[PDB]
Design a protein around this ligand. Sequence first.
Ligand SMILES: N[C@@H](CCC(=O)N[C@@H](CS)C(=O)NCC(=O)O)C(=O)O
Length: 207
Amino acid sequence: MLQILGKPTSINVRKVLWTCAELGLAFEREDWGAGFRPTNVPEFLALNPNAMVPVIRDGDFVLWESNSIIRYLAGRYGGEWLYPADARERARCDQWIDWQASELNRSWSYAFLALVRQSPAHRDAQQIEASRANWAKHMAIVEGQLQRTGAFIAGDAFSLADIPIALSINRWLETPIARDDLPAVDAYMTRLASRDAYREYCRNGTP
Ligand SMILES: N[C@@H](CCC(=O)N[C@@H](CS)C(=O)NCC(=O)O)C(=O)O
């Protein structure tokens, strides 16, 4: 059985859990990460030198990096409906997957660590606000794209890209910041409510 190493509250672990549920995979999950089981130990470092979650073990195959993992699962487990093989259709998904990780995630760092994790190391109000402002600019880009599609992030159909993106939106909505009205974003999160795995792993009260 596929093994998922990572605490269930982690946004990046939740990408993998949601993907597994969408595809129809059986899995066992072990708690790893801050607050759960420390990752900076030899047994875990041997699997992932970053000492971060998620990591998966699929038979003898070990893989880390959440967006790489969800791509792997969709490619391995009959996920062509979720992550299409056509290069242009796949690219429309990849743009948002990759931007989620390289830009959107990056933008929320200080505000999230300060306000949600209450990190004693992140108490500079100016940096909290800078992070909130930058995050807000990235959310306006998400709003623009959803205004255009009127549906899902990459087009008319739910796709792999909606998993990192909707989890990121959830983080925005659950962090205690003042937020501009983004109606296409709200309508999108309402649309997703019909998906059981979204309710289980995304909009579940955990930031
Ligand atoms: N880029 C990595 C980031 C992984 C990451 O930052 N994981 C967090 C949890 S969301 C973590 O393991 N922090 C270290 C810890 O909890 O000890 C990915 O997307 O998988």
